[PDB]
Amino acid sequence: ILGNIIESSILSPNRQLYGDMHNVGHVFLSYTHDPDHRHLESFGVMGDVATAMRDPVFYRWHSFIDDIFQEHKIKLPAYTKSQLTYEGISVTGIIVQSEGAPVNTLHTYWQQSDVDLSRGMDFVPRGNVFARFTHLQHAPFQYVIQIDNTSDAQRMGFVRIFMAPKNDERGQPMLFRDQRLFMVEMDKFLVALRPGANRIRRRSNESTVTIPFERTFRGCGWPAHMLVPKGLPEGFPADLFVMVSNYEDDRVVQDYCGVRDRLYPDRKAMGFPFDRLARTGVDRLSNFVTPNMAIQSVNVIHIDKTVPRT
Amino acid sequence: MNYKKNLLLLYDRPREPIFMGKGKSVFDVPDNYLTDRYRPIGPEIQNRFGELAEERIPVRSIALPDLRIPMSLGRQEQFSLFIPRHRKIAARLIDIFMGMRNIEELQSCAVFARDRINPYLFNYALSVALLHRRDTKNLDLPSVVEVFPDKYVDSRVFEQIREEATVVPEGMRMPIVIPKDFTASDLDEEHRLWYFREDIGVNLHHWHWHLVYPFEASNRAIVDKDRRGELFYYMHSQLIARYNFERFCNRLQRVKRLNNLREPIAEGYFPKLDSLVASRTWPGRVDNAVIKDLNRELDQIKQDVSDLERWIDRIYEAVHQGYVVDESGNRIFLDEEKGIDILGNIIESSILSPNRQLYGDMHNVGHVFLSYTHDPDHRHLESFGVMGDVATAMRDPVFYRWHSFIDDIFQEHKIKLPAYTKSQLTYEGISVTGIIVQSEGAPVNTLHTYWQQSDVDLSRGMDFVPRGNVFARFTHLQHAPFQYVIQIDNTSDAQRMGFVRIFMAPKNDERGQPMLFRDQRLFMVEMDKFLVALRPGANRIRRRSNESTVTIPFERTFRNFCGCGWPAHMLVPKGLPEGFPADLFVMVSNYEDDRVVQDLVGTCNDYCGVRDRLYPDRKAMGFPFDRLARTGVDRLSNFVTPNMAIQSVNVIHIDKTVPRT
Amino acid sequence: ILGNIIESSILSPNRQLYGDMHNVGHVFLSYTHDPDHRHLESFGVMGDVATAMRDPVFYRWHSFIDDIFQEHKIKLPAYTKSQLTYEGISVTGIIVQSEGAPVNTLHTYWQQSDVDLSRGMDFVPRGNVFARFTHLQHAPFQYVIQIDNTSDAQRMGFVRIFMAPKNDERGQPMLFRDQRLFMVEMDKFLVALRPGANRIRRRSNESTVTIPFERTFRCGWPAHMLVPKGLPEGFPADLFVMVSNYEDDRVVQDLVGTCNDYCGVRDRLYPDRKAMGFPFDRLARTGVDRLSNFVTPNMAIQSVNVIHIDKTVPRT
Ligand SMILES: [Cu+2]
Ligand SMILES: [Cu+2]
Ligand SMILES: [Cu+2]
Ligand SMILES: [Cu+2]
């Protein structure tokens, strides 16, 4: 509801009262240079969805808006130990492995790619016109998750993978209240677990948050090369987190893939483990955890070089 | 593969154990698949029926979910989808069969379950699974008459069929005549409508419609079909239109609705059916029975009449208000487009209802109340009467009263919609100048009807009866074949696409006057709706009666929309011996507006087309006449636009029995 | 809320709309014999709280009213396995023992008691006027509950004891949906559990549902009516106990607890955060079907037999 109210979608239960808050903000910010049209100038970059993210103020305005949503989320009751426990299931470890790199280590760098802008160049002599984009890229990797069943029956589960910074700006191990808002979703997929223990593997390129290279260059798809934060040359410390929830509860009976048409495939709230405040006694991630969750220290290394695509 | 054909053997002889062997086959069942009663002497039995068997189907022993819930219903009990508890049992079993990934495990699960659960329930649960799995598509399910003849035939025949099959050798067996007009004498004027109420055809159509459009299970398990709410409204609405027609052909007035539930029900009905599965008969309802508060602890029914009345009061309010309220508290508006569809889901109570808890389960609960007047607190350990089962509900006259009431509620919404403007139902350029009908050896604009015996093999359904054939002779209404001939002028300069919409109503009333629109619009029965391409200038369109999109062939039944299909022999009202006057109406609408862009090869009751996503007509169901007249209009002959035509038809009945040839 | 709406207490959020439903019903039922006052007659017994329970119609009218409340309770979400489990605590058995009677057996009978009605007899020669009441009575008994801690720390818990019929009127083992509504509260008290094993014993006369003889004659439910009558041939009944986590159920409060007719509860708050009738007020969670599979470790069931004996014991 709140979302439709704030952005102002015709789905808002009372547009007239609660207004067109997000959208009107984009216009105000884009017209500071000429607000009464006396200079016959058009809107700046924040006035177009196509270009809005280029401006730093975008993140300030969208940061504010988020705080308003948060104000609602902190009213919701904390998830109980019960609610995010999976009776029988226990995750005992998660790691990541890249080719030619230590365990629990992600790498990033720059990479040139080519795009044919020929169809867009009006009144230009026909032919090919290739442009070379430089953009962040990460070395391919894969998660390896150790899950024990101890039930006697095949258990269905949702694997939910987020990643946040390990410490704060002052260099201390982050508290939950802070860290919960910095967790970025990395993957969410359905898995069948055989009784006893199974060792689950997932490639970085199978991510349900991401869409392939081919789609961009040639919800609805975050660029694959932007999946991993940049990190530092000296290495940036990060907590990798995984949760296995009970898919039977989370299931949405129905016939990146294709979320347009019918329903969204997860009954749980979006950002589910961390959308709400901590239950009493919880203070940091390492004591928020239930058996069916696992934490892992990852180190994100950047290298200022321009690699190829082979 | 074979598997598809092997499941069809489960439908054979429902009460004979699965190890007894069906047709030219027999199942090689594990011993842990044998029932507790028979397992302790399984060796002696498997041996005893092993003889004379051609082929032998193996069955692998699988896990099998807990079948507690499916087995909760007794084996000698009746099964109805109206009863709250049965719904939960069936929906759970459907879930099991539906949840078997492979067509081999479905065969194994089925073979085990079959002899542990209620036959009627099994048949339903299987039927639903097969019809809506992907591997078991285009599969021709045996007619439910052939598997359960007890729901379709006077109980008297059963002891004749047993005699004939035991005494007389195969090949020399006489066909068993099925009694007609047997539920009441001429002291009851209602007995005249036997040929409609008690006709095998229409009862099968009703049962099947509810198969393909259930109101409970899972949206992917077939509940959320396009405009199923509107379908529920229209189909049932056409039943009463057709019934009211047949009433006029038997010197009766239009069916009176169930005004209010406290007043007695004048018309009793003893159905004369004997359930061989329950081993009992269906109870009758006496004259002037009164609805009573139900307390059927076993069935999980605790409903008061006032509950029903409360639901009705609320639904009326919503309809007048013009909007409903969902569980969340939000308002949804009963607009021109989706209003009727919503209302349908509210009234029948399909899980698609935007607020079941508030607006209730009005139609369904009514069926239960009416079926339990004779034993509402279960003190007499009696089952529900005929109105409690979709398979048999149409036999009772009260069906039409209850369904008549329900229709009035829908009407209350339709009369709020804005009249179709001259513009909206004109086709610029197109003009229909005449329509006629012609039967072989009969004047123009004249339809004939009569009685006709047909034969059906009830052999598969006769449990513990000496094997062989058992043919039964049904007598049923039939019409002489005919064809429409429609004269349409283009005057445009381009090929025009159009929908031909053909309805038929009575010409006058019972008081002898040319009917007014307000009245007549509700008595129009759909006769055909088909797409036609018109060349510039003049076009002579011809259409056979047997091409009707309202109807399904003989062959399908024996072997009124968007379900199984309406029986072909019931397409034409009976009429009178002296001739019954009727207005035939045709309209050509602009198919470009009415078109529903979609890809389909079209599909059957299992007419084809409606199993694909969408319903193939953007216009409302009953489109020319669903809404009130625009200003100035008063009767059909001044409602008409150029692209419509009227024709006086005369319907003649002849009391004779023709053969099928 | 619903309670204040239905009875009609000035606490009703809209008296004018939802009316004075319970109370007005009492008046209607009491005035059938003279509703327009043409006969100058007063109201029958249902018109006075003091006497209303004497009439059988009371239970019909109050039965209806209850169905309305139920209609709300069945909308509430089922208690989850989690919500009524006490991690660590396990009840392994409960029994009852009366002096000179088999285990798991309650006895009832008639008993005369005496009351001085002297102060109430106006214009009667002064002196004593003792009246002999005959009323149901039960032999004294005590519960014995076996609870295991398996935690390593002292655990606080609420003991919640209800009793229902075992079967129905037709003689079949009752389903939960039915039986949950027939459970009568028998006791609810706080207990401290030591690590390992604990044997809890509780007397019938310590019941928090009941008030002593002396209080009533010489506000709470009469002690002699604590146990149903049962049959001469014995009436089968399921005794149920639950130990809930008192830390969740606790109501931080300062309390006097001295016969303010039952401890009292005249202090601001009611001493239990859980709903009244808490184990059984709501519908069953999925899969549950009867009491014996509703149970969690921290609960226990026991077959009791209630025997009546048609004899008159003295009051002692
Ligand atoms: Cu924005
Ligand atoms: Cu129906
Ligand atoms: Cu119906
Ligand atoms: Cu009262």
3-state secondary structure A274-309: HCCCCCCCCCCHHHHCCCCEEEEEEEEEEEEEEECC
Residue among C46, C71, C72 at smallest CA distance from C59: C46
Cβ atoms within 10 A of the Cβ of B450, count?
A: 16
Q: At A25, list the tokens.
A: 């903000």
End-to-end CA distance of chain A: 48
* Binding-site positions of A for Cu(2+): 22, 26, 62
Give distance in angstroms: CA of C62 to centre of ligand 4.
6
Computed from CA positions of residues B151, B153, B158, B159, in that sequence, does the dihedral angle turn out positive or negative?
A: positive
Tell me if B210 sits within 8 A of B484, measured CB to CB.
Answer: no
Q: How far apart are CA A176 and CA A283, in angstroms?
A: 6
Tell me if B318 sits within 8 A of B324, measured CB to CB.
Answer: yes
Please confirm, yes or no, whether B547 is among the known catalytic residues: no
Element (H or E) spanning A250, and its range?
helix A247-250
H-type alpha helices, chain C: 2-7, 15-18, 21-30, 57-73, 176-179, 213-216, 246-249, 291-294
Q: How far apart are CA C119 and CA C125, in angstroms?
A: 11
Packed helices B398-414 and B305-321: angle between N→C axes, nearest 10 degrees: 30
Residue numbers of A annotated as active site: 7
CB-CB neighbors (< 8 A) of B220 in chain A: 253-255
Place of tokens 């007890």: B150
Q: How far apart are CA A91 and CA A242, in angstroms?
A: 8
Give distance in angstroms: CA of C156 to centre of ligand 4.
37
Place of tokens 């709501």: C282
Strand partners, C110: C136, C312
Place of tokens 């086709």: B427
Q: How far apart are CA A164 and CA A183, in angstroms?
A: 4
Minimal-distance CA residue of chain A relative to C81: A82
Q: How far apart are CA C240 and CA C163, in angstroms?
A: 6
Minimal-distance CA residue of chain A relative to B329: A13
Residue among A77, A87, A69 at smallest CA distance from A270: A69
Cβ atoms within 10 A of the Cβ of B169, count?
A: 8
CA distances from B637 to B44, B270, B524, B587, C18 (A): 77, 44, 14, 13, 54
H-type alpha helices, A116-188: 176-179
Give distance in angstroms: CA of C71 to centre of ligand 4.
19
Q: What angle do CA B187, B191, B195 make, to 5 degrees?
A: 160
Q: Hey, what amino acid is at C56?
A: P
Packed helices B339-348 and B305-321: angle between N→C axes, nearest 10 degrees: 170
DSSP one-letter code for B354: T
Q: How far apart are CA A69 and CA A3, in angstroms?
A: 8
CB-CB neighbors (< 8 A) of C80 in chain A: 82
Computed from CA positions of residues B575, B576, B579, B581, in that sequence, does the dihedral angle turn out positive or negative?
A: negative
What strands, in cross-sheet order, belong to the sheet with B538-544?
A: B431-438, B483-489, B538-544
Packed helices B200-212 and B119-131: angle between N→C axes, nearest 10 degrees: 60
Q: Residues with Cβ < 8 Å from A257, sequence gap 6 or more?
A: A208
Q: Hey, what amino acid is at A218?
A: R
Question: CA torsion, points B164, B167, B169, B173, in degrees to nearest 10?
Answer: -20
Resolution in A: 3.2
CB-CB neighbors (< 8 A) of A85 in chain C: 82
Of the listed ligands, the closest to the CA of B400 is 3
Q: How far apart are CA B440 and CA B19, in angstroms?
A: 53
Q: How far apart are CA B641 and CA B427, in angstroms?
A: 9
**Residue of C82, C84, C85 to mutate, testing the A interface (most A Cβ within 10 Å of its Cβ):** C82
Q: Residues with Cβ < 8 Å from B181, sequence gap 6 or more?
A: B191, B194, B195
Q: Out of B348, B412, B428, B592, pick the active-site residue.
A: B348
Contact B220 A13 (CB under 8 A): no
Q: Residues with Cβ < 8 Å from B134, sequence gap 6 or more?
A: none
Interface of C with A (CB under 8 A): 80, 82-83
Q: How far apart are CA A185 and CA B134, in angstroms?
A: 36
Q: Which other chains touch chain A, taking contact as 3+ CB pairs less than 8 Å apart?
A: B, C
Tell me if B398 sits within 8 A of B265, measured CB to CB.
Answer: yes
Minimal-distance CA residue of chain C relative to A81: C82
- Is residue B420 classed as helix, strand or coil in its secondary structure? coil
Q: How far apart are CA A102 and CA A298, in angstroms?
A: 11
Tell me if B82 sits within 8 A of B388, measured CB to CB.
Answer: yes
Of the listed ligands, the closest to the CA of C49 is 4
Q: Hey, what amino acid is at C141?
A: F
Would you call A36 exposed, middle or buried from its count of C-beta atoms within 10 A (0-12, 13-18, 19+)?
A: exposed
Exposure pattern of B512-529 as b/e (b: 16+ CB <10 Å)? eeebebeebbbbbbbbbb
| Strands annotated E in A224-292 | 236-246
Rounded to a whole number, what is the distance in Å from the CA of A81 to chain C's nearest CA?
9
CB-CB neighbors (< 8 A) of B219 in chain A: 253-254
Q: What angle do CA A140, A142, A144 make, to 5 degrees?
A: 165
Q: How far apart are CA B139 and CA B116, in angstroms?
A: 25
- Is residue B366 classed as helix, strand or coil in its secondary structure? helix
Place of tokens 């109807």: B551
Minimal-distance CA residue of chain B relative to A12: B330
Give distance in angstroms: CA of C53 to centre of ligand 4.
8
Q: How far apart are CA B466 and CA B149, in angstroms?
A: 16
Number of H helices, E strands in chain C: 8, 11
Q: Which other chains touch chain B, taking contact as 3+ CB pairs less than 8 Å apart?
A: A
CB-CB neighbors (< 8 A) of C83 in chain A: 82
Contact A13 B330 (CB under 8 A): yes
CA distances from B20 to A42, B42, B107, B267 (A): 86, 12, 17, 45
Would you call C166 exposed, middle or buried from its count of C-beta atoms within 10 A (0-12, 13-18, 19+)?
A: buried
Computed from CA positions of residues B368, B374, B380, B384, in that sequence, does the dihedral angle turn out positive or negative?
A: negative
Q: Residues with Cβ < 8 Å from A164, sequence gap 6 or more?
A: A174, A179, A182, A183, A184, A238, A239, A241, A285
Q: At C232, list the tokens.
A: 């001469």
DSSP B305-323: HHHHHHHHHHHHHHHHHTE
Contact A253 B218 (CB under 8 A): yes
Q: How far apart are CA C227 and CA C237, in angstroms?
A: 11
Tell me if B348 sits within 8 A of B232, measured CB to CB.
Answer: yes
Q: Residues with Cβ < 8 Å from A286, sequence gap 6 or more?
A: A295
Size of interface A-C (CB pairs under 8 A): 6
Q: How far apart are CA C269 and CA C283, in angstroms?
A: 27
Q: Residues with Cβ < 8 Å from C271, sequence gap 6 or more?
A: C251, C253, C255, C265
Q: At A69, list the tokens.
A: 């949503």
Minimal-distance CA residue of chain A relative to C82: A82
CA distances from B17 to B10, B24, C57, C121 (A): 10, 16, 53, 81
Q: Hey, what amino acid is at B233?
A: Y
Minimal-distance CA residue of chain C relative to A84: C82
Strand partners, B523: none
Tell me if B542 sits within 8 A of B484, measured CB to CB.
Answer: yes
Residue among C240, C130, C227, C125 at smallest CA distance from C188: C240
Give distance in angstroms: CA of B239 to centre of ligand 2.
9
Q: How far apart are CA C166 and CA B520, in angstroms?
A: 63
Q: What angle do CA B188, B194, B195 make, to 5 degrees?
A: 150
Asked if residue B236 belongs to a known ligand binding site, the reply is yes
Q: Name the region of B439 (left: φ>0; alpha: ψ -120 to 50; beta: rest).
A: beta
Name the phi and psi angles at B654, rounded to 5.
Answer: -135, 120
Of the listed ligands, the closest to the CA of C53 is 4
Cβ atoms within 10 A of the Cβ of B101, count?
A: 8
Give distance in angstroms: CA of B348 to centre of ligand 2.
9
Q: How far apart are CA C291 and CA C304, in angstroms?
A: 15
Q: At B553, list the tokens.
A: 């062939």
Number of H helices, E strands in chain A: 8, 11
Tell me if B244 sits within 8 A of B238, measured CB to CB.
Answer: no
CA distances from B25 to B9, B54, B111, B468, C115 (A): 8, 6, 14, 15, 86
Question: CA torsion, points A6, A7, A13, A15, in degrees to nearest 10?
Answer: 90
Q: How far apart are CA B435 and CA B488, in angstroms?
A: 9
Of the listed ligands, the closest to the CA of B207 is 2
CB-CB neighbors (< 8 A) of A82 in chain C: 80, 82-83
Q: Residues with Cβ < 8 Å from B448, sequence gap 6 or more?
A: B439, B442, B479, B480, B652, B653, B654
Asked if residue C62 belongs to a known ligand binding site, the reply is yes
**Residue of A10, A11, A154, A253 to mutate, testing the B interface (most B Cβ within 10 Å of its Cβ):** A253
Q: Residues with Cβ < 8 Å from B321, sequence gap 6 or more?
A: none
Contact A254 B220 (CB under 8 A): yes
Give distance in angstroms: CA of B407 to centre of ligand 2.
12
- Is residue C86 classed as helix, strand or coil in its secondary structure? coil
Interface of A with C (CB under 8 A): 80, 82-83, 85
Looking at chain A, after which residues does the C atom sit over 2.5 Å from the next written N, breaking the chain? 218, 255
CB-CB neighbors (< 8 A) of A83 in chain C: 82
Would you call B637 exposed, middle or buried from its count of C-beta atoms within 10 A (0-12, 13-18, 19+)?
A: exposed
Name the phi and psi angles at C243, rounded to 5.
Answer: -110, 110
Place of tokens 């047709």: B23
